[PDB]
Amino acid sequence: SLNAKKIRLENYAMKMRLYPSPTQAEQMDKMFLALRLAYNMTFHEVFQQNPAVCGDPDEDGNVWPSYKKMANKTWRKALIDQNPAIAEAPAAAITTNNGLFLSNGQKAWKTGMHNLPANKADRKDFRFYSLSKPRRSFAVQIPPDCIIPSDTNQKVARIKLPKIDGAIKARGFNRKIWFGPDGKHTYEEALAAHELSNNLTVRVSKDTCGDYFICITFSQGKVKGDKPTWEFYQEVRVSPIPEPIGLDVGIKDIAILNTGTKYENKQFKRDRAATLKKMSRQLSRRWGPANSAFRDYNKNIRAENRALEKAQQDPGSSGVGPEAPVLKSVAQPSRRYLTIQKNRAKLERKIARRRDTYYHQVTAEVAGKSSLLAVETLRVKNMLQNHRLAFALSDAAMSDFISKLKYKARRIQVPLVAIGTFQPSSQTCSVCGSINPAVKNLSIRVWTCPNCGTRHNRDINAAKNILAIAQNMLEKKV
DNA sequence: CCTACTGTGTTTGAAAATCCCG
RNA sequence: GGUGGGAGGUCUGUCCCCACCAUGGGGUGCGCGCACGUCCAAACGACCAUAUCGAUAUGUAACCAUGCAUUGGAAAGUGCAUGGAGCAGAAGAAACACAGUAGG
DNA sequence: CGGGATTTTCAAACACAGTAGGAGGGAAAGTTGTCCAGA
């Protein structure tokens, strides 16, 4: 009867929605600014070849940044010496294994700059933190003593982060998680029984609009042998009698299963496309950025500011009061622009959330029933070759669906067998597999097979063929 | 001529040592 | 009753709440009314008021309770400090980096 | 003065440049009206 079954999972990440009083929000975004300034100062000093940061020079004369030299007190005290808006970041948010320099800078230099030394690697191809990409995280380590739920309710918390005061009110526990060895304890029971970690990672990430999400991540730090260092369970509902399932996707659909059920892609992109164009041409004529009529004003004022500063500093000698240096301001987007920007951002977030929840529901439904997933591909680049699906999958991001199927097939260990998109899936039949080249075109919906078939739906036939192929390759290993 | 979703890969703390306002 | 919406982590409907479109026409039936299923006309991220060239700006909304200062003789609000926020059915793994891409 | 809170150490430094020819359905453009969009 689709009952909930507790399953041990590797590394959970609770997704909540904090409610920080204005002071707490101010402290959080000041910490985001502190992390971005540490990022910028470090990676702008690596290109000046500062001996404090650069690692051991090699015998060839090359100079690399070594990340162990980059996470000591002396560096942070130099940083606070330069500017006072840099110590507000948590110390554990910068130096720890899951902080700003062994988790973000490491991957960034390993991927963007191809792991090349600072003397050879180029600068203008590396993306820093600025108004385009501010720092949307910081991963402190807290004790469960700072994670206090509420018992009058059954979904609310009380989280007080380091360096901040007020016990920020979380919301929405995933209470279907269970602690202890057999998953029979609530959070308070395991906190009192001492079967939980001490320093927990909360990766406080703010979304595009002000929405101070928190991620109280769990883990199994050491799983030496088979027992993890920590144990907890999570319950999801699985069909009483699962069967192998093959999935198909159509232009007018979002998913079709071999059982017969068909799911409709609401496809919100065109649904709100009229209002989308409304607000697009709205902000395209506003008085701030993303305008093409106020950027030029901002560039002009910045250029004249720098030119006058250069022509007043050296030629004027800055003795006591030479000339009259005026700076004014770089101008800001207007409130009327601001309200419409925030409303439109809420709208793209609304389609994002609607689509995300819809795919979450679809994946949750299929994953429990599917004892053996038989989807074709694990990537979208094999679905865009014919250009027919691209027009729909551009609006419906199917790679997120791929990822959701991937990690919801893993928590039950549901296999996900993938095969190449080259077989005569359309030509073959569900009964005898007779090859008919006329079916290749998508427009055919009903085609009576000459021998013993009627084939009123291609989607069922294709899913049947894919499932049969997946079974056959299991029967004889390739 | 500038903003913004996305496709893809990777990753997910414990423990001595030092500090700070009742 | 529909139109779009705001809070209850997210979605569907209701709950509470924000600004609008109709009181219409009609295909077929029953005895001027009722309409068996429809469809159209709407309302679409506010509406107002202001000034200066539809649209640019500005004062601006979407749950309940407590306390504080304020507007208030009031009735009820403003700001601040908090707290509380369902119901029926669904789900509830996130963060980082790279770039192309689409929009105007 | 003192007991929990923050905070350094484990613990570990360096990727990118290569080379074509393999498969198929999706596809019209380009009007002056009414109003539209900024004007």
Coordinates of all heavy atoms in Angstrom, one line a residue, chain A residues 151-231:
Chain A
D151 N 8.9 21.3 20.0 CA 8.0 20.2 20.2 C 6.5 20.5 20.2 O 5.7 19.6 19.9 CB 8.3 19.5 21.5 CG 9.8 19.2 21.7 OD1 10.6 20.0 22.2 OD2 10.2 18.0 21.3
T152 N 6.2 21.8 20.5 CA 4.8 22.2 20.3 C 4.4 22.1 18.8 O 3.3 21.6 18.5 CB 4.6 23.6 20.7 OG1 5.5 24.5 20.0 CG2 5.0 23.8 22.2
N153 N 5.3 22.5 17.9 CA 5.2 22.2 16.5 C 6.0 20.9 16.2 O 6.7 20.4 17.0 CB 5.6 23.4 15.6 CG 5.1 23.3 14.3 OD1 4.6 22.3 13.8 ND2 5.0 24.5 13.6
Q154 N 5.9 20.5 14.9 CA 6.6 19.3 14.5 C 7.5 19.6 13.2 O 7.8 18.7 12.5 CB 5.7 18.1 14.2 CG 5.2 17.5 15.5 CD 6.3 17.1 16.4 OE1 6.5 17.7 17.5 NE2 7.1 16.1 16.0
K155 N 7.7 20.9 12.9 CA 8.5 21.2 11.7 C 9.5 22.4 11.9 O 10.1 22.8 11.0 CB 7.6 21.5 10.5 CG 6.8 22.7 10.7 CD 6.3 23.2 9.4 CE 5.5 22.2 8.6 NZ 4.7 22.8 7.5
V156 N 9.5 23.0 13.1 CA 10.2 24.2 13.4 C 11.5 23.9 14.2 O 11.5 22.9 15.0 CB 9.3 25.3 14.0 CG1 10.0 26.6 14.2 CG2 8.1 25.4 13.2
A157 N 12.4 24.8 14.2 CA 13.7 24.6 14.9 C 14.1 25.9 15.6 O 13.3 26.9 15.6 CB 14.8 24.3 13.9
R158 N 15.3 25.9 16.2 CA 15.9 27.1 16.7 C 17.4 27.0 16.5 O 18.0 26.2 17.2 CB 15.6 27.3 18.2 CG 14.2 27.9 18.5 CD 14.3 29.4 18.4 NE 12.9 30.0 18.3 CZ 12.7 31.2 17.8 NH1 13.6 31.9 17.2 NH2 11.4 31.6 17.8
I159 N 17.9 27.7 15.5 CA 19.3 27.5 15.1 C 20.0 28.9 15.4 O 19.6 29.9 14.9 CB 19.5 27.2 13.6 CG1 18.6 26.0 13.2 CG2 20.9 26.8 13.3 CD1 18.9 24.7 13.9
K160 N 21.0 28.8 16.2 CA 21.9 29.9 16.5 C 23.3 29.6 16.0 O 23.9 28.7 16.4 CB 22.0 30.3 18.0 CG 22.6 31.6 18.3 CD 22.8 31.8 19.8 CE 23.4 33.1 20.1 NZ 24.7 33.3 19.4
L161 N 23.7 30.4 15.0 CA 25.0 30.1 14.3 C 26.1 30.8 15.0 O 25.9 31.7 15.9 CB 24.9 30.7 12.9 CG 23.7 30.1 12.0 CD1 23.4 31.1 10.9 CD2 24.0 28.7 11.5
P162 N 27.4 30.4 14.8 CA 28.5 31.1 15.4 C 28.5 32.6 15.0 O 28.1 33.0 13.9 CB 29.7 30.4 14.9 CG 29.2 29.1 14.3 CD 27.8 29.4 13.8
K163 N 29.1 33.4 15.9 CA 29.3 34.8 15.7 C 28.0 35.6 15.6 O 28.0 36.8 15.5 CB 30.2 35.1 14.5 CG 31.6 34.6 14.6 CD 32.4 35.3 15.6 CE 33.8 34.7 15.7 NZ 34.6 35.1 14.5
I164 N 26.8 35.0 15.7 CA 25.5 35.6 15.5 C 24.7 35.3 16.7 O 24.8 34.3 17.3 CB 24.8 35.2 14.2 CG1 23.6 36.0 13.8 CG2 24.3 33.8 14.3 CD1 23.1 35.8 12.4
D165 N 23.8 36.3 17.0 CA 22.9 36.2 18.2 C 21.5 36.3 17.8 O 21.1 37.1 17.0 CB 23.3 37.4 19.2 CG 23.4 38.7 18.4 OD1 23.3 38.7 17.2 OD2 23.5 39.7 19.1
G166 N 20.7 35.4 18.4 CA 19.2 35.5 18.3 C 18.5 34.1 18.1 O 17.3 34.1 18.1
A167 N 19.3 33.1 17.8 CA 18.7 31.7 17.6 C 17.7 31.8 16.4 O 16.5 31.6 16.6 CB 18.1 31.2 18.9
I168 N 18.2 32.0 15.2 CA 17.4 32.1 14.0 C 16.5 31.0 13.9 O 16.8 29.8 14.0 CB 18.4 32.2 12.8 CG1 19.3 33.5 12.8 CG2 17.5 32.3 11.5 CD1 20.6 33.3 13.5
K169 N 15.2 31.3 13.6 CA 14.1 30.3 13.6 C 14.1 29.6 12.2 O 13.7 30.2 11.2 CB 12.8 31.0 13.8 CG 11.6 30.2 13.6 CD 10.3 31.0 13.7 CE 9.1 30.1 13.9 NZ 9.0 29.5 15.2
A170 N 14.5 28.4 12.2 CA 14.4 27.6 11.0 C 12.9 27.2 10.8 O 12.0 27.5 11.6 CB 15.3 26.4 11.0
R171 N 12.6 26.5 9.7 CA 11.3 26.0 9.4 C 11.3 24.8 8.5 O 12.2 24.8 7.6 CB 10.4 27.1 8.8 CG 9.0 26.7 8.5 CD 8.2 26.4 9.7 NE 7.9 27.5 10.6 CZ 6.9 28.3 10.5 NH1 6.0 28.2 9.5 NH2 6.8 29.3 11.3
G172 N 10.4 23.9 8.7 CA 10.3 22.8 7.8 C 11.4 21.7 8.0 O 12.2 21.5 7.1
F173 N 11.3 21.0 9.1 CA 12.1 19.8 9.2 C 11.7 18.7 8.3 O 10.5 18.6 7.9 CB 12.1 19.2 10.7 CG 12.9 19.9 11.7 CD1 12.9 19.5 13.0 CD2 13.8 20.8 11.3 CE1 13.7 20.1 13.9 CE2 14.7 21.4 12.2 CZ 14.6 21.1 13.5
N174 N 12.7 17.9 7.8 CA 12.3 16.7 7.0 C 12.2 15.6 8.1 O 13.1 14.8 8.3 CB 13.4 16.4 6.0 CG 13.5 17.4 4.9 OD1 14.4 17.3 4.0 ND2 12.6 18.4 5.0
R175 N 11.1 15.6 8.8 CA 10.9 14.8 10.0 C 10.9 13.3 9.6 O 11.0 12.4 10.5 CB 9.6 15.1 10.7 CG 9.7 16.4 11.5 CD 9.7 16.2 13.0 NE 9.8 17.4 13.8 CZ 10.4 17.5 14.9 NH1 10.9 16.4 15.6 NH2 10.5 18.7 15.5
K176 N 10.8 13.0 8.3 CA 10.9 11.6 7.9 C 12.3 11.1 8.0 O 12.5 10.0 7.4 CB 10.3 11.4 6.5 CG 8.9 11.8 6.4 CD 8.0 11.4 7.6 CE 6.7 12.1 7.5 NZ 6.8 13.5 6.9
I177 N 13.2 11.8 8.6 CA 14.6 11.3 8.9 C 14.5 10.8 10.3 O 13.9 11.3 11.2 CB 15.6 12.4 8.7 CG1 15.5 13.5 9.7 CG2 15.6 13.0 7.3 CD1 16.4 14.6 9.5
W178 N 15.2 9.7 10.5 CA 15.2 9.0 11.8 C 16.7 8.7 12.2 O 17.5 8.2 11.4 CB 14.4 7.8 11.9 CG 12.9 8.1 11.7 CD1 12.1 7.5 10.7 CD2 12.1 8.9 12.5 NE1 10.8 8.0 10.8 CE2 10.8 8.9 11.9 CE3 12.3 9.8 13.6 CZ2 9.7 9.6 12.4 CZ3 11.3 10.5 14.1 CH2 10.0 10.4 13.5
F179 N 17.0 8.9 13.5 CA 18.3 8.8 14.0 C 18.5 7.5 14.8 O 17.5 6.7 15.0 CB 18.7 10.0 14.9 CG 18.6 11.3 14.2 CD1 18.0 12.4 14.7 CD2 19.2 11.5 12.9 CE1 17.9 13.6 14.1 CE2 19.1 12.6 12.3 CZ 18.5 13.7 12.8
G180 N 19.7 7.3 15.4 CA 20.0 6.1 16.1 C 20.3 4.9 15.2 O 20.4 5.1 14.0
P181 N 20.7 3.8 15.8 CA 21.1 2.7 15.0 C 20.1 2.1 14.1 O 20.4 1.7 12.9 CB 21.6 1.6 16.1 CG 20.8 2.0 17.3 CD 20.6 3.5 17.2
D182 N 18.8 2.0 14.5 CA 17.8 1.4 13.7 C 16.7 2.5 13.2 O 15.7 2.1 12.8 CB 17.1 0.3 14.4 CG 18.0 -1.0 14.5 OD1 18.8 -1.2 13.6 OD2 17.8 -1.7 15.5
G183 N 17.1 3.7 13.4 CA 16.2 4.8 12.9 C 14.9 4.8 13.7 O 13.8 4.9 13.1
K184 N 15.0 4.8 15.0 CA 13.8 4.8 15.9 C 13.8 5.9 16.9 O 13.2 5.8 18.0 CB 13.6 3.4 16.6 CG 14.9 2.8 17.1 CD 14.5 1.7 18.2 CE 13.8 0.6 17.5 NZ 14.8 -0.3 16.7
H185 N 14.6 7.0 16.7 CA 14.7 8.1 17.6 C 14.4 9.4 16.8 O 14.7 9.5 15.7 CB 16.1 8.2 18.2 CG 16.5 6.9 18.9 ND1 16.6 5.7 18.3 CD2 16.9 6.7 20.2 CE1 17.0 4.8 19.2 NE2 17.2 5.4 20.4
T186 N 13.8 10.3 17.5 CA 13.6 11.7 17.0 C 14.9 12.4 17.3 O 15.9 11.9 17.9 CB 12.4 12.4 17.6 OG1 12.3 13.7 17.0 CG2 12.7 12.6 19.1
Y187 N 15.0 13.7 16.9 CA 16.3 14.4 17.0 C 16.6 14.6 18.5 O 17.8 14.5 18.8 CB 16.1 15.8 16.3 CG 17.4 16.7 16.4 CD1 18.4 16.6 15.5 CD2 17.5 17.6 17.5 CE1 19.5 17.4 15.7 CE2 18.6 18.4 17.6 CZ 19.6 18.3 16.7 OH 20.7 19.1 16.9
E188 N 15.6 15.0 19.3 CA 15.9 15.2 20.7 C 16.4 13.9 21.4 O 17.3 14.0 22.3 CB 14.7 15.8 21.4 CG 14.1 17.0 20.7 CD 13.1 16.7 19.7 OE1 12.3 15.7 19.9 OE2 13.0 17.4 18.7
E189 N 15.8 12.8 21.0 CA 16.3 11.5 21.6 C 17.7 11.2 21.3 O 18.5 10.8 22.2 CB 15.4 10.4 21.2 CG 13.9 10.5 21.6 CD 13.8 11.1 23.0 OE1 13.9 10.3 24.0 OE2 13.5 12.3 23.2
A190 N 18.1 11.4 20.0 CA 19.5 11.1 19.7 C 20.5 12.1 20.2 O 21.6 11.8 20.6 CB 19.6 11.0 18.2
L191 N 20.0 13.4 20.3 CA 20.9 14.4 21.0 C 21.1 14.1 22.4 O 22.2 14.2 23.0 CB 20.2 15.8 20.8 CG 20.7 16.9 21.7 CD1 22.2 17.1 21.5 CD2 20.0 18.2 21.4
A192 N 20.0 13.6 23.1 CA 20.2 13.2 24.5 C 20.9 11.9 24.7 O 21.6 11.7 25.7 CB 18.8 13.2 25.2
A193 N 20.7 11.0 23.8 CA 21.4 9.7 23.9 C 22.8 9.7 23.3 O 23.5 8.6 23.4 CB 20.6 8.6 23.1
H194 N 23.3 10.8 22.7 CA 24.6 10.9 22.2 C 25.0 9.9 21.2 O 25.9 9.0 21.4 CB 25.6 10.9 23.4 CG 25.6 12.1 24.3 ND1 26.0 13.3 23.9 CD2 25.1 12.3 25.6 CE1 25.8 14.2 24.8 NE2 25.3 13.6 25.9
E195 N 24.2 9.9 20.1 CA 24.6 9.1 18.9 C 24.7 10.0 17.7 O 24.3 9.6 16.6 CB 23.5 8.0 18.7 CG 23.8 6.7 19.4 CD 22.6 5.8 19.3 OE1 21.4 6.3 19.1 OE2 22.8 4.6 19.5
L196 N 25.2 11.3 17.9 CA 25.2 12.3 16.9 C 26.6 12.9 16.8 O 27.3 12.9 17.8 CB 24.1 13.3 17.1 CG 22.7 13.1 16.5 CD1 21.7 13.8 17.3 CD2 22.7 13.4 15.0
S197 N 26.9 13.6 15.7 CA 28.1 14.3 15.6 C 28.2 15.5 16.5 O 27.1 16.0 16.9 CB 28.4 14.7 14.1 OG 28.5 13.6 13.2
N198 N 29.4 16.0 16.7 CA 29.6 17.2 17.5 C 29.6 18.5 16.6 O 28.7 19.4 16.8 CB 30.9 17.1 18.3 CG 30.8 16.1 19.3 OD1 31.5 15.1 19.3 ND2 30.0 16.3 20.3
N199 N 30.5 18.6 15.7 CA 30.6 19.7 14.8 C 29.8 19.4 13.5 O 30.3 18.7 12.6 CB 32.1 20.1 14.5 CG 32.8 20.5 15.8 OD1 33.1 21.7 16.0 ND2 33.1 19.5 16.6
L200 N 28.7 20.0 13.3 CA 27.8 19.8 12.1 C 28.0 20.9 11.2 O 28.1 22.1 11.6 CB 26.4 19.6 12.5 CG 25.9 18.3 13.0 CD1 24.4 18.3 13.2 CD2 26.3 17.1 12.1
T201 N 28.0 20.6 9.9 CA 28.1 21.6 8.8 C 26.8 22.2 8.4 O 25.9 21.4 7.9 CB 28.9 21.0 7.6 OG1 29.9 20.1 8.1 CG2 29.4 22.1 6.7
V202 N 26.6 23.5 8.5 CA 25.4 24.2 8.0 C 25.9 25.1 6.9 O 26.7 26.1 7.2 CB 24.6 24.8 9.1 CG1 24.1 23.8 10.1 CG2 25.4 25.8 9.9
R203 N 25.5 24.9 5.7 CA 26.0 25.7 4.6 C 24.9 26.7 4.2 O 24.1 26.5 3.3 CB 26.3 24.7 3.4 CG 27.4 23.7 3.8 CD 27.7 22.8 2.6 NE 28.3 23.4 1.5 CZ 29.6 23.7 1.4 NH1 30.5 23.3 2.3 NH2 30.1 24.3 0.3
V204 N 25.0 27.8 4.9 CA 23.9 28.8 4.8 C 24.0 29.6 3.5 O 24.9 30.4 3.3 CB 24.1 29.8 6.0 CG1 23.0 30.9 5.9 CG2 24.0 29.1 7.3
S205 N 23.2 29.2 2.5 CA 23.2 29.7 1.2 C 22.0 30.6 0.9 O 20.8 30.1 1.1 CB 23.3 28.6 0.2 OG 22.1 27.8 0.2
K206 N 22.2 31.8 0.6 CA 21.1 32.7 0.3 C 20.8 32.6 -1.2 O 21.7 32.5 -2.1 CB 21.5 34.2 0.6 CG 20.5 35.2 0.2 CD 21.0 36.6 0.5 CE 20.0 37.7 -0.1 NZ 20.6 39.0 0.0
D207 N 19.5 32.6 -1.5 CA 19.0 32.4 -2.9 C 19.0 33.8 -3.6 O 19.5 34.8 -3.1 CB 17.7 31.8 -3.0 CG 17.7 30.2 -3.0 OD1 18.9 29.7 -3.1 OD2 16.7 29.6 -2.8
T208 N 18.5 33.8 -4.9 CA 18.6 35.0 -5.7 C 17.8 36.1 -5.1 O 18.4 37.2 -4.9 CB 18.1 34.7 -7.1 OG1 16.7 34.3 -7.0 CG2 18.9 33.6 -7.7
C209 N 16.6 35.9 -4.7 CA 15.9 36.8 -3.8 C 16.3 36.6 -2.4 O 16.9 35.5 -2.1 CB 14.4 36.6 -4.0 SG 13.7 37.1 -5.6
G210 N 16.0 37.5 -1.5 CA 16.4 37.3 -0.1 C 15.6 36.2 0.4 O 14.4 36.3 0.8
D211 N 16.2 35.0 0.6 CA 15.6 33.8 1.1 C 16.7 33.0 1.8 O 17.4 32.1 1.1 CB 14.9 33.0 0.0 CG 13.5 33.4 -0.2 OD1 12.9 34.1 0.7 OD2 12.9 33.1 -1.3
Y212 N 16.9 33.2 3.1 CA 18.1 32.7 3.7 C 18.0 31.3 4.0 O 17.8 30.8 5.2 CB 18.3 33.6 5.0 CG 19.2 34.8 4.7 CD1 18.7 36.1 5.0 CD2 20.4 34.7 4.1 CE1 19.5 37.2 4.7 CE2 21.2 35.8 3.8 CZ 20.7 37.0 4.1 OH 21.5 38.1 3.9
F213 N 18.2 30.5 3.0 CA 18.1 29.0 3.1 C 19.3 28.6 3.9 O 20.4 29.2 3.9 CB 18.1 28.3 1.8 CG 16.8 28.2 1.2 CD1 16.0 29.3 1.0 CD2 16.3 27.0 0.8 CE1 14.7 29.2 0.4 CE2 15.0 26.8 0.3 CZ 14.2 27.9 0.1
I214 N 19.2 27.5 4.7 CA 20.2 26.8 5.4 C 20.2 25.4 5.0 O 19.2 24.8 4.6 CB 20.1 27.0 7.0 CG1 21.3 26.5 7.7 CG2 18.9 26.2 7.4 CD1 21.4 27.0 9.1
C215 N 21.4 24.7 5.2 CA 21.6 23.3 4.8 C 22.3 22.7 5.9 O 23.5 22.7 5.9 CB 22.3 23.2 3.5 SG 21.5 24.1 2.1
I216 N 21.6 22.0 6.8 CA 22.2 21.4 8.0 C 22.7 20.0 7.6 O 22.0 19.0 7.9 CB 21.2 21.4 9.2 CG1 20.8 22.8 9.5 CG2 21.9 20.8 10.4 CD1 19.9 22.9 10.7
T217 N 23.8 20.0 7.0 CA 24.3 18.7 6.3 C 24.7 17.7 7.4 O 25.2 18.1 8.5 CB 25.5 19.0 5.4 OG1 25.1 20.1 4.5 CG2 25.9 17.8 4.6
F218 N 24.4 16.4 7.1 CA 24.9 15.3 7.9 C 26.0 14.6 7.2 O 26.4 15.0 6.0 CB 23.8 14.4 8.3 CG 22.6 15.0 9.1 CD1 21.5 14.2 9.4 CD2 22.7 16.3 9.5 CE1 20.5 14.8 10.1 CE2 21.6 16.9 10.2 CZ 20.5 16.1 10.5
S219 N 26.5 13.5 7.7 CA 27.6 12.8 7.1 C 27.8 11.4 7.8 O 27.1 11.1 8.8 CB 28.9 13.6 7.1 OG 29.4 13.7 8.4
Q220 N 28.7 10.7 7.2 CA 29.3 9.5 7.8 C 30.8 9.6 7.6 O 31.4 9.2 6.7 CB 28.7 8.2 7.1 CG 28.6 8.3 5.6 CD 28.3 6.9 5.0 OE1 28.1 5.9 5.7 NE2 28.2 6.9 3.7
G221 N 31.4 10.4 8.6 CA 32.7 10.8 8.4 C 33.7 9.7 8.1 O 34.5 9.7 7.2
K222 N 33.6 8.6 8.9 CA 34.5 7.4 8.8 C 33.6 6.2 8.8 O 32.8 6.0 9.8 CB 35.6 7.4 9.8 CG 36.8 8.2 9.5 CD 36.6 9.7 9.8 CE 36.4 10.0 11.2 NZ 36.1 11.5 11.5
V223 N 33.7 5.4 7.8 CA 32.9 4.2 7.7 C 33.8 3.0 7.7 O 33.5 2.0 7.0 CB 32.0 4.3 6.4 CG1 30.9 3.2 6.4 CG2 31.5 5.7 6.2
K224 N 34.9 3.0 8.5 CA 35.8 1.9 8.6 C 35.1 0.6 8.8 O 34.3 0.5 9.7 CB 36.8 2.2 9.7 CG 38.0 1.3 9.8 CD 38.4 1.0 11.2 CE 39.3 -0.2 11.3 NZ 40.7 0.0 10.8
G225 N 35.5 -0.4 7.9 CA 34.7 -1.6 7.9 C 33.4 -1.5 7.2 O 33.4 -1.3 6.0
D226 N 32.3 -1.5 7.9 CA 31.0 -1.3 7.4 C 30.2 -0.3 8.2 O 29.3 0.4 7.7 CB 30.2 -2.6 7.2 CG 29.1 -2.5 6.2 OD1 29.0 -1.4 5.5 OD2 28.3 -3.5 6.1
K227 N 30.4 -0.2 9.5 CA 29.6 0.7 10.4 C 30.1 2.1 10.2 O 31.3 2.4 10.4 CB 29.7 0.2 11.8 CG 29.4 -1.2 12.1 CD 27.9 -1.5 11.8 CE 27.6 -3.0 12.1 NZ 28.2 -3.9 11.1
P228 N 29.3 3.1 9.8 CA 29.7 4.4 9.8 C 30.0 5.0 11.1 O 29.5 4.5 12.1 CB 28.6 5.2 9.0 CG 27.7 4.1 8.6 CD 27.9 2.9 9.5
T229 N 30.7 6.1 11.2 CA 30.9 6.8 12.4 C 29.6 7.3 13.0 O 29.5 7.3 14.3 CB 31.9 8.0 12.2 OG1 33.2 7.5 11.8 CG2 32.1 8.7 13.5
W230 N 28.7 7.7 12.2 CA 27.3 8.1 12.6 C 26.3 7.3 11.8 O 26.5 7.0 10.7 CB 27.2 9.6 12.5 CG 28.4 10.4 13.0 CD1 29.3 11.0 12.2 CD2 28.8 10.5 14.3 NE1 30.2 11.6 13.0 CE2 30.0 11.3 14.3 CE3 28.3 10.1 15.6 CZ2 30.6 11.7 15.4 CZ3 28.9 10.5 16.7 CH2 30.1 11.3 16.6
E231 N 25.1 7.2 12.4 CA 24.0 6.4 11.8 C 22.7 7.2 11.9 O 22.4 7.7 13.0 CB 23.9 5.0 12.5 CG 23.0 4.1 11.7 CD 23.3 2.6 12.0 OE1 23.9 2.3 13.0 OE2 22.8 1.7 11.2

